[PDB]
Every structure is written in C-alpha cells, then in structure tokens.
Ligand binder design. Structure first.
Ligand SMILES: *[C@@H]1O[C@H](CO)[C@@H](O[C@@H]2O[C@H](CO)[C@@H](O[C@@H]3O[C@H](CO[C@H]4O[C@H](CO)[C@@H](O)[C@H](O[C@H]5O[C@H](CO)[C@@H](O)[C@H](O)[C@@H]5O)[C@@H]4O)[C@@H](O)[C@H](O[C@H]4O[C@H](CO)[C@@H](O)[C@H](O)[C@@H]4O)[C@@H]3O)[C@H](O)[C@H]2NC(C)=O)[C@H](O)[C@H]1NC(C)=O
Ligand SMILES: *[C@@H]1O[C@H](CO)[C@@H](O[C@@H]2O[C@H](CO)[C@@H](O[C@@H]3O[C@H](CO)[C@@H](O)[C@H](O[C@H]4O[C@H](CO)[C@@H](O)[C@H](O)[C@@H]4O)[C@@H]3O)[C@H](O)[C@H]2NC(C)=O)[C@H](O)[C@H]1NC(C)=O
Ligand SMILES: *[C@@H]1O[C@H](CO)[C@@H](O[C@@H]2O[C@H](CO)[C@@H](O)[C@H](O)[C@H]2NC(C)=O)[C@H](O)[C@H]1NC(C)=O
Ligand SMILES: CC(=O)N[C@@H]1[C@@H](O)[C@H](O)[C@@H](CO)O[C@H]1O
Ligand SMILES: CC(=O)N[C@@H]1[C@@H](O)[C@H](O)[C@@H](CO)O[C@H]1O
Ligand SMILES: *[C@@H]1O[C@H](CO)[C@@H](O)[C@H](O)[C@H]1NC(C)=O
Ligand SMILES: *[C@@H]1O[C@H](CO)[C@@H](O)[C@H](O)[C@H]1NC(C)=O
Ligand SMILES: *[C@@H]1O[C@H](CO)[C@@H](O)[C@H](O)[C@H]1NC(C)=O
Lengths: 231, 210, 439
C-alpha cells in the first residue's frame, strides 16, 4: 500500500551538498522508519543511515561525518543531504521504509534481546553522478527506415548523440506507441559524453505516414526534444 | 565484492551466507538486479512478505549451529540477480554492511542468434558535418559478442566505440556499436559493413551511400 | 528387714556425653563417575534396615545449639574437603599477569572477560601464550584494564578441584559406637530446645544430605504440620534464626551459557582446565521461584514470627558481610552460583533472581587454600526444593526487620541435627533387695 518516489539533481559538483528527496504516497511518515541505501558502480550496496518515526537519526560510521537525514512532516517526504561529496559518492540512491523487529533469545528483564531493521518497501531509485564537468544537452537526429526485413516488419529509430550525464528517458508518440520499442544502453565516448539509440520495429504497411515522433528528455540539461522520423 | 554461483535451469539452488553468526540471529535476504530496485525475499529467517513466491526460503535457527542458506527451487531465467545476506546476531554489534553480493547465473539457457541492424548516418547529422554508423545488436544469448567494422574489405579499427552487452526485459542481451567518421570519409568508400561475431557464428550487415 | 545391695549389669541408664561418631552411607554403586567427597574412598555401609526403638514413657531434654554432632560434622566436612584437594593440581603458576578484554555482547552492561596470558609449558625453559575466559569475580586489575590477576594470588595459593570428584551431596547417616546411643525427638511441633515427650533411640541418623547453602536452605526435611521457628535465643539479635517450612517452595537455577572446557597443560602431568570461548548467546545465570508460592510462604512465616515478638514485621536484603554471605550461594551441577535475593526480601509471573558465577572460592570462611571450580561443559540446569531459611535481626519492639544471613555454616547441619542427641550408656546399677550371697 506504500509507494516511494526519489527525486534529485542527477549531477552534483565535487565538494558540495548533494541533496535527494523521497516522496511517500501510501501512509504517514511518522508511523514507519525510513532509510537510505546507495549502489555505487563496481561495488556492493551500502546502508548509509536511517531515520525513526520519532525523528531520531543514526548514521553509518564511515559516512556519519558527512551525512544528515531529515523528515518533512507537512509533505510525506524525507531528504538526504551529503556534504563534501567526491567521485566516490556517485551512486544510485534508493530510499526504503524500514521496520524495527526485536529478536529476543532469553529473558527480557536481563537484556538478552537485540533490535534488527529490514527494508520491506523500496523506491525506484535516483541516479546521481558527481563530476566537475558541465551539463550537456543531447542532440537528437532521426534514423530513417531502410525500407529492413521481409514484410511486414521494418525498423526506424532516434539517435541521441553525446550528452552528460546519465540518464536519458526516451518514449514514442508521448508514450502512445509501446509495441516494438527497444532503447539501447548508452556508450561513454572518449569525449566524456554518453550516446544512446532508441528503435521501433513497425510494419512496412504502417509506413506511411503514421508520423512517428520520439520524445527525448534529459533532466540535468532541462531539454525536452521531440523529433519526427521519415524516409 | 561479488562471488559467482552457477545453477542449471529448473534445478533447485542453495545460496551460502558469508559471515555466519556467533549467536541467535534474524537474517534478511535481498534480491538485487543491476540498475533496478532491490526486493527483499526473506525478512525473518523463514518469513517472506506477501507476493514473494513459495520457491524462495531461508533456514530457521531452531537449534544453534545451522548455517543461513537461501534455497531457490525451480530456478528460471528471471531469478538471475545479485543476492545479499544481511546478518544480525546477538554477539556482534550493529551490522551496517549487507553481505557480500552473490552473482547467481542460470546455466543451460537457450542460445539466441543476434538480431543486428546497421543504420547509416542520418541526413541531419551529415548536415551538422559529422557521421556515425550505428550497429544495434538485440536478443542474443550468451551476452558475449565481438564487433569488427569493415570499409569494403579493409577493417576500420579507428573511431570505434562499443558498449559491453547488457540484459533487457526479454532476458536476452543487447549491445550497440558506434563508428564515428567524417561525412567525406563516409562518402569516399563504396560500402560499410558491421560484422558481429556471436560464438562461432558471424552476422554481417552492409550499408552504402545512396 | 535385712536389705543388701545387688549389682545389676545392663540397666537402661544413660548420661549426656560427646564421643567420636563415624560416617555411614547406603551402598550406592557409582560406576562411570565415582568418589564424591562425602562417600570418599571408603565409608561404612548402613544396616539393610536400621531399627528405631520407641522409648516408652521417656521425656528427655534436648539442645540443638549445644549439640556436639554439629561441631563434629562441621570439622568432618572441612577435613574431607582438604583430603580431596590434596592430590589435585595446584595452580600456583597460573598467577602470571593476565591480558584481559571484555567478551562480545550487546552494549548493555560485562562480567565475563577474555584473558590472554603466558603460562609455563611441560618443558621448564619453554613458555606458551594461551587465552582463557574468567568471570569478573575471579579477577582484579593489577594496574589497568589493558592487562589483571586472579583475586586469590595476593591472599593465598590456589588448587584446582579434580574433575572426577563430584560436589553432589548424598545421604550420610551419622552413627554412634557401641556403648553409646542416639536419641531422636519424635515430637511434631518440636522447638529447638527443651523436653521432648515422644522419644526414640537409634544407632544411626536418617540420610542427611550435606547441602552447602546460604540464606535459604535447599533439599532439607520439612517440618510436619505447622512451620517451626528455631533460635538459640529469640531476644538476642546476634544469634541467627532457623526457619523450617512445611510446604516446599521449588527453585529452578540455570546457567544458559554453553561453556567449553580447554585442557591446557601447565606441566609434567599437570592439566589446568580453562574456560574456552562460549558457544551461542551470552545469557547470565538466574533462578526462578513462584511469586504465588513464595508470597504465601513468606506470609505464613510472618504469622509464626508474631508468636514470639508479636507488631510490624519487615523483610530487607543483606547489608553486611562478603559476597558469599550477602547472596544466596550454593552449588549447581559443579558451578558455584551467587544469587541476588533482594527481590525476595522486600516486603505464573515467577520472580527471577540475578545469579553471578565464581570459579575461585574459599568456603567456610577458609583463609589460605582457595579452590578453582573447573568449568562445566554445556548448559547447566538444576531444580531444588527450598525447605528452610536463615534469618537475622538488625537489633525497639516498635518495628522488627528480618534480613537473611549465613554467618555460620554450622546452621545448615543444625537444621537437620536438631532432632538428634548423643548419650553414653551406664549399664551398672546397684539397688537393695532381700538377697545375700553364700557366707
Ligand atoms: C509407662 O508408664 C505407665 C504409667 O506409669 C505404666 O502403666 C502402668 O502399667 C502397670 C503395669 O506395669 C499397670 O499396673 C497394673 O495394672 C493392671 C491393669 O488392670 C487390668 O484389669 C482391668 C480389667 O477390668 C483393666 O483396668 C486393665 O486394662 C488395661 O490393661 C490391659 C492389659 O491387658 C491393656 O490392654 C489395656 O490398654 C488397659 O489399659 C487390665 O486388664 C493390673 O492387672 C496389674 O496387676 C497385676 O500385675 C501386678 C504386677 O505387675 C501384680 O502385683 C498384681 O497381683 C496383678 O497380677 C497392675 O496393677 C498400670 O495399670 C498402668 N497405668 C498406670 C499406673 O497409670 C507402664 O508400666 C509404662 N509402660 C511401659 C511400656 O513401660
Ligand atoms: C521453645 O520451646 C519451649 C516451649 O515451652 C521453651 O522451653 C522453656 O521455656 C521457658 C520460657 O522461655 C523457660 O522457663 C520459663 O521462664 C519464664 C521467664 O523467666 C518463667 O515465667 C517460667 O515459669 C513458669 O514455670 C514455673 C515452673 O515452676 C511455674 O511456676 C509456672 O508455670 C511459670 O509460668 C519458666 O521458668 C525455659 O528456660 C525454657 N527452656 C527449657 C529447656 O525448659 C523454650 O523457651 C522455647 N523457646 C526457645 C527460644 O527455645
Ligand atoms: C513417632 O511416632 C509415630 C506415630 O505415633 C510412629 O510412626 C510409625 O512407625 C512405624 C514403624 O515402627 C510404622 O509402621 C508406622 O506406619 C508409623 N506411623 C505412622 C502414622 O506413619 C513412630 O514410632 C515414630 N516416628 C518415626 C519417624 O519413627
Ligand atoms: C587481604 C587482601 O589482600 N585482600 C585482597 C585485596 O587485595 C583487595 O583490596 C580486596 C578488595 O577490598 O580483595 C582481596
Ligand atoms: C525431591 C525433589 O526434588 N522434589 C520433590 C519430589 O520428590 C516430590 O515427588 C514432589 C511432590 O510430588 O515435590 C518435589
Ligand atoms: C608473554 O611473553 C612474551 C615473551 O615470550 C612477551 O612478549 C609478552 O609480552 C607476554 N604476554 C603479555 C600479555 O604480556
Ligand atoms: C596485551 O597487552 C597490551 C598492553 O600492554 C595490549 O596493547 C595488547 O592489545 C594485549 N594483547 C592482546 C592480544 O590482548
Ligand atoms: C538471651 O538474650 C539476652 C540478650 O537479648 C541475654 O541477656 C541473655 O543472657 C540470653 N540468654 C541466653 C541463654 O542466651
């Protein structure tokens, strides 16, 4: 019954304050615990800190010097600030609702129990790169149909040329066409700029003109590019 | 860092938890696909949240000495992901780190031939005084390919940029190769060909200037 | 009219005396584990069936507090303990400086300590660094927590108890020699001292278990009908107060820790038994008694206490003495428990007592030879019957306060030797009859 939604910058300069925000829809933020986990590339995922229902924080000893987690009461949202970020802090930042269980192995009066936390509901996750390099808008050039296989099918697409940083979200006809769509992984060029391709397999009877437009969005650069494709 | 596990398709698999406990314990088991949200399979050693199937299960510590193992029955293509074993015991303090990742790999999957599509540089890119031949490779397994480019007979070997294969929602792999040229270099040659070798087989697609 | 003395030999006449009584124990097997300290290498087997002869019309004055059987048993138990410890391994070279750290647990208190130290090897020239766990009571910091010695090493030498000899009390019957006899008070409501109307004689006593215990008494015999309050002098606060229950309260004592024994050789044939690392959870020892049964027991005690002093009767914990007097100390399965009875004397939701453990011990206030109780493998659990109490007055007639005490171990022997008394027969009688011998 609970849905989390991470929002964040995508890019942050080194030696700055990284901020991310996690919008909760399902319930109250002062009933369950909340926590942040990050997945930096080429490393296993790291639990960085949690915030209670009571507004009491606890941080991982490695990042405790640099981290602060907060809970907004009016908005069902929780933030994570991280001061003096570096190249290492580049990661996919997930938020998740944590649940405190107590494991009791003997008598309660003596102690003989320990608290444990487990994160049942996760958010989708927000990618965050840390780099001195500036933001670049993607150049969108349309890939024409070759006119490709034996009928019905033929292939067209859209090229998203060098941009920075990841990610780019691509849809077709403002998400009207879902059949045949396949957006590929981007390539990091020696330039230091990512480039991807998105392609749609449509029948050669449908072409044409069905007026196929690809809708590109790059949230760091704030550039929404709609481009027609045609033989 | 990650430890590799290999399992035949349809056979049951048991995932050993690193750092096994010193006292009574309440482990968690997290399934994590690369790029996607982690999903916990087990929160208390036996218990699974609603919606997780009955295939996954973890060992209770009814009698001390038992070792934490995540048991997956009927292993399928979709089960292939990273598994983390979060460990909490009575003796050790606050467990901050999750367990070392366990890379499950599902063996004996059906091999798929690569669907290559070579696109010539777009008219509007040539208008910008640049050219990139785009060779897109989809729906292939195992995800291991070597891309070689050709101008006529001669191999290009320069301005070649290629992504390592990454999985798609089909559970097959998808890779793309980019060959940057000048518009004049694109026009100079007769045709250009993208050779994609998948295992023994090699698929070639050829495109020429109109 | 002419009366003459006439000698009668074997008249039933006796006088109060004190003689050397001897041990008697029923023929128990003891085959896989044997030679407990009270049976020893040899004790005399009892009669297949001992005879108790009711002495009709006899009224005899008893005194449990001036009883000599108590003083003999006390000196017997002490001597027996020394005979058992003599051949065992002595841990004089275990007084090296100890490098100690706390054991792994959740940060809520740490009694238990993991201690590394050099020890002499089987070779004289060579030395070994070993580790062992010790309880906080056994050790004291020589300077800092960085390193520690054993508590005893400054005061006196130490000796390990042999792992074969068991601390389990067994029934022991005390017997008198020929020409003497034991008189048993058969009276149900028998006070400590005074005349006993219903008396019997026996050659040997009932099976008394030598249960070493403090504050509350364990596995005794229960007083029939009404609970009996015994004291040497009720108005004197210095003398303790024996209580004997009629309905037994039961006590459940466990050490949940699954300890391990580590045989480290400290020597030519010398094997010191250390505590290895604990397996599983860190749970401290405890004892449970039923809140309903205890509160009923303590109720009935206050009623029969008011027969003497008669007025407010209060119970408080022990405020005087060492760690061994203040807590309810006893043995359970080999380990020596020291239980905090402040819960009980402060007047099924069972009342739980915090029990600490000590391995180095000096019982009967013994100064000099200290004993190392070897660690016991696995989880410990015992279940005992609480039959009596040992109380003490603070020392008025406005409010009375009774604290538990174990000022003398003799009290425990008294609690079962109340009903017995030693006498010597004087079989020569002379009396007048009209009978003269041949001239
Ligand atoms: C403990 O202490 C007590 C008290 O001091 C002692 O009890 C006394 O014992 C003496 C004997 O040693 C008794 O004196 C004798 O009394 C009998 C009793 O009379 C008989 O006749 C009646 C029948 O109508 C009846 O009253 C009696 O019944 C009782 O006795 C029977 C025994 O069969 C018994 O089963 C019952 O329980 C009854 O209680 C009984 O039938 C009397 O017969 C005696 O005279 C004979 O013996 C003497 C010599 O001993 C002799 O001189 C006579 O010529 C005659 O042959 C004798 O007077 C006395 O009654 C008891 N009670 C007292 C004094 O109060 C006892 O000795 C001690 N016990 C022990 C075990 O040591
Ligand atoms: C335990 O059990 C018995 C229960 O009777 C008890 O033994 C005797 O008790 C009394 C009282 O402690 C002691 O003697 C008495 O002392 C008082 C006070 O001085 C006197 O008033 C008594 O006189 C009575 O007896 C006279 C006899 O001629 C009669 O004239 C008349 O009946 C008087 O009331 C009496 O002297 C006595 O010393 C003890 N002990 C013994 C061995 O007899 C005992 O006290 C109880 N309690 C304890 C703590 O032991
Ligand atoms: C004290 O008196 C009691 C009862 O008056 C006696 O107990 C009896 O002892 C005989 C053995 O000689 C048994 O056969 C009976 O069963 C006992 N009676 C009861 C009621 O149980 C005995 O003379 C004395 N007590 C003891 C312990 O010997
Ligand atoms: C007689 C003697 O030396 N006793 C020791 C002493 O080192 C220490 O001070 C005491 C605690 O008070 O424990 C014991
Ligand atoms: C001796 C012992 O430890 N416990 C006794 C047991 O013998 C007895 O049968 C029970 C009453 O049923 O009371 C308790
Ligand atoms: C034990 O003896 C060695 C020398 O053999 C010494 O280096 C060490 O300091 C001793 N151990 C401790 C805890 O002092
Ligand atoms: C032994 O004692 C020293 C203090 O001098 C301490 O630094 C060291 O950690 C101890 N060694 C061990 C193994 O406990
Ligand atoms: C009994 O108690 C009082 C002390 O309260 C004392 O004066 C008296 O002499 C004592 N008598 C005996 C026999 O202990």
């Amino acid at each position: 019954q609970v849905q989390l939604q991470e929002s964040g910058p995508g890019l942050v300069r080194p030696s700055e304050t990284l901020s991310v925000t996690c919008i909760v829809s399902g319930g109250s933020i002062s009933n369950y615990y909340w926590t942040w986990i990050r997945q930096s590339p080429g490393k296993g995922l790291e639990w960085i800190g949690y915030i209670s229902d009571r507004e009491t924080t606890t941080y991982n000893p490695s990042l405790n010097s640099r981290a602060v987690i907060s809970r907004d009461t009016s908005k069902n949202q929780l933030s994570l600030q991280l001061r003096s970020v570096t190249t290492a802090d580049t990661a996919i930042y997930f938020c998740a609702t944590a649940r405190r269980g107590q494991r009791i192995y003997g008598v309660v009066s003596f102690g003989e129990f320990f608290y444990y936390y487990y994160m049942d509901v996760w958010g989708k996750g927000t990618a965050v790169t840390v780099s001195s390099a500036s933001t670049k808008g993607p150049s969108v050039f349309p890939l024409a149909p070759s006119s490709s296989t034996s009928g019905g099918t033929a292939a067209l697409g859209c090229l998203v040329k060098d941009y920075f940083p990841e990610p780019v979200t691509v849809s077709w006809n403002s998400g009207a066409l879902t059949s045949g769509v396949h957006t590929f992984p981007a390539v990091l060029q020696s330039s230091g700029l990512y480039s991807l391709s998105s392609v749609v397999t449509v029948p050669s009877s449908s072409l044409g003109t069905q007026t196929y437009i690809c809708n590109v969005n790059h949230k760091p650069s704030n550039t929404k590019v709609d481009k027609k494709v045609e033989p | 860092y990650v430890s590799p596990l290999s399992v035949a398709l349809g056979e049951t698999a048991r995932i050993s938890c690193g750092r096994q406990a010193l006292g009574s314990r309440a482990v968690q088991w997290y399934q994590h696909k690369p790029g996607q949200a982690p999903i916990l399979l087990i929160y208390n050693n036996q218990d699974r949240p609603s919606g997780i199937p009955e295939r996954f299960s973890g060992t209770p510590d009814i009698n001390f000495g038992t070792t934490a193992t995540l048991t997956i029955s009927g292993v399928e293509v979709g089960d292939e992901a990273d598994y983390y074993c979060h460990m909490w015991d009575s003796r050790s303090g606050f467990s901050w780190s999750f367990g070392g990742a366990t890379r499950l790999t599902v063996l004996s999957q059906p091999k798929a031939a690569p669907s290559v599509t070579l696109f010539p540089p777009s008219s509007e890119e040539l208008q910008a005084n640049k050219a990139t031949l785009v060779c897109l490779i989809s729906d292939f397994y195992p995800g291991a390919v070597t891309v070689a480019w050709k101008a006529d007979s001669s191999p290009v070997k320069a301005g070649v940029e290629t992504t390592t294969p990454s999985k798609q929602s089909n559970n097959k792999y998808a890779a793309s190769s980019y060959l940057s040229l000048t518009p004049e270099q694109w026009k100079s040659h007769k045709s250009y060909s993208c050779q994609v070798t998948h295992e023994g087989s090699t698929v070639e697609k050829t495109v020429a200037p109109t | 009219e002419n009366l003459w003395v006439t000698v009668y030999y074997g008249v039933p006449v006796w006088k109060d005396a004190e003689t050397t009584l001897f041990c008697a124990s029923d023929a128990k097997a003891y085959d896989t584990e044997k030679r407990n300290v009270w049976a020893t290498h040899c004790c005399v087997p009892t009669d297949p069936n001992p005879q108790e002869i009711v002495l009709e019309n006899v009224t005899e004055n008893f005194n449990m507090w001036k009883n000599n059987m108590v003083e003999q048993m006390h000196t017997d138990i002490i001597s027996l303990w020394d005979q058992s410890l003599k051949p065992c391994v002595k841990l004089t070279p275990l007084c090296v400086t100890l490098n100690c750290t706390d054991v792994n647990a959740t940060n809520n208190t740490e009694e238990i300590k993991n201690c590394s130290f050099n020890i002499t090897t089987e070779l004289r020239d060579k030395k070994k660094k070993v580790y062992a766990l010790f309880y906080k009571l056994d050790v004291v910091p020589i300077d800092d927590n960085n390193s520690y010695r054993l508590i005893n090493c400054n005061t006196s030498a130490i000796t390990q108890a042999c792992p074969k000899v068991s601390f389990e009390p067994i029934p022991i019957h005390y017997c008198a020699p020929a020409g003497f006899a034991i008189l048993k008070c058969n009276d149900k409501k028998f006070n400590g001292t005074g005349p006993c109307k219903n008396v019997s004689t026996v050659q040997c006593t009932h099976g008394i278990k030598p249960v070493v215990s403090t504050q509350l008494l364990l596995n005794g015999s229960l007083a029939e009908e009404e609970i009996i309050i015994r004291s040497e002098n009720i108005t004197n606060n210095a003398k303790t107060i024996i209580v004997q229950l009629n309905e037994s309260v039961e006590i459940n004592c466990t050490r949940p820790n699954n300890n391990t024994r580590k045989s480290i050789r400290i020597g030519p044939g010398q094997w010191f038994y250390a505590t290895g690392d604990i397996i599983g959870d860190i749970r401290q020892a405890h004892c449970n008694i039923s809140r309903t049964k205890w509160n009923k027991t303590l109720q009935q005690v206050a009623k029969k206490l008011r027969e003497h002093f008669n007025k407010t009767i209060i119970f408080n914990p022990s405020s005087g003495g060492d760690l061994e007097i203040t807590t309810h100390s006893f043995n359970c399965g080999g380990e020596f428990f020291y239980c905090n009875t402040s819960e009980l004397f402060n007047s099924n939701n069972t009342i739980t007592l915090p029990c600490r453990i000590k391995q180095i011990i000096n019982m009967w206030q013994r100064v000099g030879q200290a004993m190392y109780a070897p660690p016991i493998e696995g989880k410990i659990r015992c279940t005992s019957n609480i039959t009596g109490l040992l109380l003490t007055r603070d020392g008025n007639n406005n409010t009375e306060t009774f604290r538990p005490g174990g000022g003398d171990m003799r009290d425990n022997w008294r609690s079962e030797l109340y009903k017995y008394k030693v006498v010597k027969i004087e079989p020569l009688g002379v009396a007048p009859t009209r009978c003269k011998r041949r001239v």
